[PDB]
Design a protein around this ligand. Structure first.
Ligand SMILES: Nc1ncnc2c1ncn2[C@H]1C[C@H](O)[C@@H](COP(=O)(O)NP(=O)(O)OP(=O)(O)O)O1
Ligand SMILES: [Mg+2]
Length: 57
DNA sequence: AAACTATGCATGCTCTACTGCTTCTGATCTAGTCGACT
């Protein structure tokens, strides 16, 4: 598809047994960066958000 | 020699405080239902 309504990703680690708490850390880091308008919760393995994309113009 | 007053005792009622036991209430928590999303 060339058009959509959302962008969906899947995060994994080829090595077994390391992504115990990956998502909270990445989400909080992005929030510190200042891009998440909405976090589903503001250990979980799923979340939907509303990113803040800066357009080139 | 008699009357007044200092001293004390015995008892009931009341404020005040303190310690301990029991019960009630505010606060900390899992099941059911509807709804959101993917
Ligand atoms: N009700 C459901 N039942 C089963 N699987 C589902 C599902 N809803 C989603 N999935 C699975 C399959 C879906 O591909 C994926 C999430 O896809 P989306 O972001 O909800 N819709 P997409 O991005 O594909 O299209 P568009 O750009 O037009 O909005 O999760
Ligand atoms: Mg999507």
């Amino acid at each position: 598809k060339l058009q959509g309504h959302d962008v969906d990703f899947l995060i994994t680690h080829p090595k077994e047994g390391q992504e115990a708490g990956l998502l909270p850390r990445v989400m909080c880091r992005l929030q510190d960066q200042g891009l998440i308008l909405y976090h589903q919760h503001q250990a979980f393995e799923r979340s939907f958000c509303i990113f803040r994309l800066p357009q080139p113009p």
